[PDB]
Amino acid sequence: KFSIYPPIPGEESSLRWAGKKFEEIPIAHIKASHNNTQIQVVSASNEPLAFASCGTEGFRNAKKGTGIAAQTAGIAAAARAKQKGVIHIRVVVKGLGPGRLSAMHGLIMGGLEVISITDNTPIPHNGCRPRKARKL
Amino acid sequence: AKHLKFIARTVMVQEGNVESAYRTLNRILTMDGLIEDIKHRRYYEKPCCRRQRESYERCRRIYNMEMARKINFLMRKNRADPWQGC
Amino acid sequence: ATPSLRGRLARFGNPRKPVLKPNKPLILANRVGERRREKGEATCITEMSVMMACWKQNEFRDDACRKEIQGFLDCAARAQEARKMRSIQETLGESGSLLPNKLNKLLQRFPNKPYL
Amino acid sequence: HITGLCGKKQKEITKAIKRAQIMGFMPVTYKDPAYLKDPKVCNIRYRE
Amino acid sequence: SRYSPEFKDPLIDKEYYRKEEKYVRELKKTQLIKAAPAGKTSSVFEDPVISKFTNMMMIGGNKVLARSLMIQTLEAVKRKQFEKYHAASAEEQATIERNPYTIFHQALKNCEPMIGLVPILKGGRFYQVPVPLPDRRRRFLAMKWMITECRDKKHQRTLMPEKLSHKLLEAFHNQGPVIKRKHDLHKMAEANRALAHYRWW
Amino acid sequence: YFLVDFYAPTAAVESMVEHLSRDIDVIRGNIVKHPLTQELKECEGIVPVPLAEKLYSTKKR
RNA sequence: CCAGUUGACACAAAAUAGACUACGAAAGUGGCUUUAACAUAUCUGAACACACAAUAGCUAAGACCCAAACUGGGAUUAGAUACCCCACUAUGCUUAGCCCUAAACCUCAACAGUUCAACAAAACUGCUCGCCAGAACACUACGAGCCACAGCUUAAAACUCAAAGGAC
Ligand SMILES: [Mg+2]
Ligand SMILES: [Mg+2]
Ligand SMILES: [Mg+2]
Ligand SMILES: [Mg+2]
Ligand SMILES: [Mg+2]
Ligand SMILES: [Mg+2]
Ligand SMILES: [Mg+2]
Ligand SMILES: [Mg+2]
Ligand SMILES: [Zn+2]
């Protein structure tokens, strides 16, 4: 009953959501930064659908990456997407912050349903030595 | 980059219950061993501080395993007054 | 499974290095860790967002956004009831972990014997 | 702890895994999809 | 402690006693009873809303005068209604309403602030935290706003009953100072779409 | 994944790896010694590890 | 010429195994392949000697994702030359030379063997190299020696002390 296992693209994905193949569902990039949150729904062919960031909401400070503001931004992005035809999306989370689950909840409220919780966060295997330590 | 794009870390969702898939992805990431890695990569961990962190983690893990074993062994005694003699 | 731990402390016979430098002695204490509680989370997020959206669409009248304000108030009442239920269960039944007093009394019945 | 192998055996297994990852006999950031038919060897905590 | 741990207040409910229950009645009987107060006389005319309104309007502990002034202002409102209906013009009962229950309902509807404000700082700067509130707190805040608006005491010309009547008639038609204050509170709450997570409780 | 077994000398593995890296059609591949040549050390499962063998002094404290 | 998918894509290192004690006289060393291999089937034996030896700093050899002392500013206190942020010079590096320091602390010396003052790692039996038997002065001056010139190894002297010092 719905195998969460990696759905390989081999013959053949026999699961459609209102006429949509898993190998063609529009992508939804949600950068969950520490003190910021952005909603950039990039289509498969790199097209726009809902680039509604917290900067356009009104505030340009730490108020970006929060809960209620992030959910409102996600709802606005979901409305903008539904105005163009999207509904189903493959969330691509980036970074760890308040804009991780609140954005998904706002998108669900708007109307967009999530089918996969993908996360391509930056995992440097001892590569880029991060910023030095800091004190309080 | 040179790896296949959408195959791994693809926790599917259904029934409109993203909380279940969210918790599943969280459990997967915790069992894999990368959430703490990224949290510590948020800044530069000094080699001294890194070794201290690893030592403290190993010590706490050994202590937790010992405590869990002791609990699983001694959870039998949980009645009340079986003898009532005193 | 309990991992190895022989060649990890700085002892006489041990000729290796002290890879594990415990800051305190490894003696199973007669107490257990305390379970956290309380956290500034401020629930009611979806209803707050939908109420904000409704107020943005309309103005600030209670007769216009009644469909959303009623749900917001219901969710606030449900959050208060859940807070009360949690405060009550803190003394009745603890979710996840067990009452530390139980293990405390159990260890008091059969405490440690490290000093022989 | 979960797998339950010995020191030498686990060392050899991980060395072979690393050799296959470097040379090019196994995907690094994921598992080979062409060889998924494998019984429950390890106690996969995730997915229960 | 001025109240004695022995004596306890009574139970004035009596309408239900006109037809488990016997045990509750025996328990109520076996209770150190006290006498009822005069100010908060729970009689037939003890309307909780108007009772609280008079209690708030109470000055110098003169709840009698507060209730008298409230009744007089209600009578003046009804007299204005009659002037618009019976006293002066002809009885036009089809386009005039003399029931203050409609006014009370409109007030309860469009005079309740559903978002509280508590200055909860975090570090060293005050931050407004929009926290929800239950029905009791909302009704109490609505009553307090109505009463403090009716008690302007700053025009330096209007009288207490005239002030109350004028403010009530202004707030009736979905306007007035109370509804404007509610709208301002809603706007202020909307202005903080992110600063709603600094709550300790 | 072609496998070409051979018996090359000792001081030639690095040269062969460099030659392979120089090739264009060859993707990659590290020349590792024969795996079956490594005589396995006959191990017999895990042994019962004992508990802590004295790690603290004996004092009432 | 900034934030998000894809395409030619880092002269630094490898994450889960790291929940393993593995190898070295010490620091130290874990993604793979290799050129060689770790003396002692009697032990100790030089700080008049031989080999060296974390990082630290310097002269050239290129610059890097990131950071980079001092620096510029922003809010900041009477004051900040610091605690929050952005960029950077030498630098964290190798390709060629160094100086020769450490909390080099596991502050428990090597060899064969047995069952306590307090913190700590319970006591030792026989043998051996080095060191000490007051504190600041004294990781110093004076000597001696060093590719080192504000440096490094041993290293004091007069005065003050009623003390210095470790554990609970
Ligand atoms: Mg390098
Ligand atoms: Mg040395
Ligand atoms: Mg940089
Ligand atoms: Mg400075
Ligand atoms: Mg540089
Ligand atoms: Mg060391
Ligand atoms: Mg000797
Ligand atoms: Mg010596
Ligand atoms: Zn093994």
Side-chain angles (χ1 to χ4, degrees), chain A:
Chain A
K1 186 177 177 183
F2 204 70
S3 59
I4 294 111
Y5 284 90
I8 52 162
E11 285 79 354
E12 199 270 311
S13 60
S14 178
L15 306 164
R16 265 75 166 181
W17 278 261
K20 271 188 175 182
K21 298 175 185 176
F22 186 75
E23 67 97 43
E24 212 72 34
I25 279 162
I27 296 155
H29 290 100
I30 299 162
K31 191 177 191 298
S33 303
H34 304 85
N35 59 355
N36 189 2
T37 178
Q38 311 194 136
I39 298 127
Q40 184 167 0
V41 189
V42 187
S43 321
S45 69
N46 201 358
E47 278 191 354
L49 300 169
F51 182 67
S53 71
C54 275
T56 63
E57 179 263 314
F59 304 111
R60 283 202 296 167
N61 305 124
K63 296 163 193 175
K64 296 170 176 197
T66 61
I68 289 131
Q71 194 170 21
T72 51
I75 291 156
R80 284 174 61 182
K82 198 85 87 172
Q83 279 185 353
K84 302 167 184 174
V86 168
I87 301 160
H88 302 285
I89 43 159
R90 279 177 293 176
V91 174
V92 171
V93 184
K94 200 176 261 72
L96 304 171
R100 195 134 178 283
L101 182 128
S102 296
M104 300 177 93
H105 264 60
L107 294 162
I108 296 151
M109 285 172 67
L112 311 194
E113 177 54 34
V114 180
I115 196 170
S116 74
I117 313 188
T118 55
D119 44 352
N120 53 2
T121 68
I123 302 160
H125 310 149
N126 286 317
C128 304
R129 47 184 316 292
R131 192 236 186 82
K132 64 188 194 296
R134 56 175 193 73
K135 305 292 290 304
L136 304 172

Side-chain angles (χ1 to χ4, degrees), chain E residues 58-70:
Chain E
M58 199 190 316
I59 173 154
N62 198 356
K63 194 177 175 165
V64 187
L65 179 52
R67 191 158 284 178
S68 87
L69 293 164
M70 193 70 208

